[PDB]
Ligand SMILES: [Cl-]
Ligand SMILES: [Cl-]
Ligand SMILES: [Cl-]
């Protein structure tokens with residue numbers, strides 16, 4: 013896709029939704045009300061490579077849980093917003109602070125609360141399992157599903173657009 | 189016709205296991221349970237409620253997990269440990285002064301079938317038992333616990349011309 | 361022919377992991393397990409029991425989780441931590457006074473094979489090791505943990521003409 | 533035949549954990565503790581491999597007692613966790629066992645496995661491996677990690693070494 017590659021070039025900030033994007037969208041509940049969530053190892057590797065390439069990252073979530081706080085910290089995610097349903101307001105405040113334009117922002121989502129952002133940013137993507145209305149209004153859909161490498165693919169699409177994937181791969185393959 | 193059946197709906201009822209969940213039962217060594225729901229499903233149920241359709245759950249099982257989940261979503265009527273689902277329904281229909289033709293029901297297995305057979309919009313999830321699928325008016329594309337409920341909700345919103353308005357909150 | 365092999369069945373025997381579950385083992389840090397079962401399977405086992413076929417589980421692993429699940433389902437005979445499945449079965453058969461031809465067994469791996477090869481209806485689930493699939497009388501279309509046990513129960517009920525009645529309950 | 537040929541000389545079979553022995557999911561509870569899932573087909577395959585005289589190892593960049601217990605339950609003789617440089621660890625282990633790269637098989641799913649995968653005699657990826665790894669491995673299993681890929685890999689080695697029949701024989705009497 014000419015359009016996605018081109019949209020990838022200007023990205024300085026990559027924002028992820030949590031449930032449905034970093035997870036497969038399942039909520040595990042125990043009888044006491046505590047939760048379990050699941051993330052994916054390909055995704056963690058993708059996010060680390062993206063950050064190492066100079067792209068900053070953020071998560072904006074309508075829910076709130078220490079599990080997400082821990083995961084974000086482990087991956088080096090620099091900006092974490094939880095318990096925020098108004099995602100565009102949150103983003104606008106982040107961008108005012110970092111002084112970036114919408115065209116410098118990539119966002120990966122799965123559902124309606126992600127849509128006001130997806131519609132505005134430079135690289136607004138849906139995961140394959142995303143609500144179809146969100147799919148139809150995004151710039152691109154990942155092939156992989158959330159919690160199954162969608163976030164990794166998003167990461168690689170950006171690294172590739174910016175000419176940085178090859179360098180990332182050379183760390184692990186001696187021929188390049 | 190499915191859209192026609194959807195128009196008249198005033199009450200949408202869900203089974204739990206196999207419909208709000210994927211049918212899996214998780215047990216720890218001491219017998220406590222874990223259960224999985226889906227976020228697409230929650231957004232769908234919240235949008236149906238907002239549209240003015242009331243919702244209920246009827247389950248043969250019983251767990252605090254489901255009470256919490258029902259409350260978090262604003263589900264107005266919850267019946268658990270009830271194997272006789274049509275008797276539960278009849279009672280609720282009395283309280284609400286509704287007939288069968290105004291009830292949608294989303295089910296996955298034999299105990300849901302007496303209801304599915306009788307209501308205005310009786311649907312099975314994709315993973316439902318084949319015999320239930322055969323006797324339902326419709327079958328969702330999505331599987332239970334993987335957005336079959338969100339799909340059921342939108343079907344009803346769409347049928348009632350309320351889906352565009354629910355989307356408009358996010359396109360402004 | 362499978363329908364023919366189903367007729368004489370008086371005892372139905374299940375492996376646990378990969379048959380009543382998807383083959384996944386969940387472990388927590390402290391070392392304790394979580395196991396997952398499926399609601400279609402439970403409904404299927406209850407109907408088969410109600411038709412007058414008795415049920416058993418033979419497993420090489422051992423956990424209180426499986427004991428509780430067996431009890432909840434009304435599974436009559438439970439053997440865990442058993443390496444030689446054929447030895448265990450021979451003894452149960454002597455005690456119940458049945459021949460191999462009256463036994464159905466559903467398994468997923470090598471330890472199940474000596475039984476599967478000897479009984480009247482020796483079946484593998486879809487996700488079974490291919491060597492076991494190749495030496496079974498039949499293979500369920502569904503995967504373990506995902507309704508393969510249900511499917512196996514319905515094959516017996518159907519072979520014995522009892523499925524139609526089991527369904528009728530839900531058509532009234 | 534190429535894979536069959538590489539399998540002949542194997543004396544050590546090494547596995548990544550996440551994405552190879554598991555489907556790659558990481559389960560976290562509120563208090564930080566984890567759950568991990570393994571697969572019973574995989575356990576049988578690994579036990580059969582060991583029984584044939586091929587030793588086994590695990591090299592992971594993560595660290596959890598769950599893996600320690602799983603490896604001990606399966607009889608996996610060598611375990612290294614928290615190890616970012618997988619080759620460095622393999623080299624240390626090979627000198628101890630006095631084995632060479634050509635006698636090693638490795639089953640991986642992501643970039644940190646690729647340098648080992650490129651060095652060894654039988655360097656395989658699972659079906660769900662990052663595609664760049666799949667492209668550079670000697671071979672790819674049909675099965676996905678956590679769903680029998682390890683079993684399929686074990687059986688490849690067993691068969692290559694004329695040992696699968698004997699493994700199956702126990703169950704044909
Ligand atoms: Cl990770
Ligand atoms: Cl939700
Ligand atoms: Cl059940």
Ligand SMILES: [Cl-]
Nearest residue numbers: 571572575576
């Ligand atoms: Cl095992």
Ligand SMILES: [Mg+2]
Nearest residue numbers: 029031032122
């Ligand atoms: Mg989401």
Ligand SMILES: [Mg+2]
Nearest residue numbers: 203205206296
């Ligand atoms: Mg159900």
Ligand SMILES: [Mg+2]
Nearest residue numbers: 375377378468
């Ligand atoms: Mg088994």
Ligand SMILES: [Mg+2]
Nearest residue numbers: 548550551641
């Ligand atoms: Mg890995």
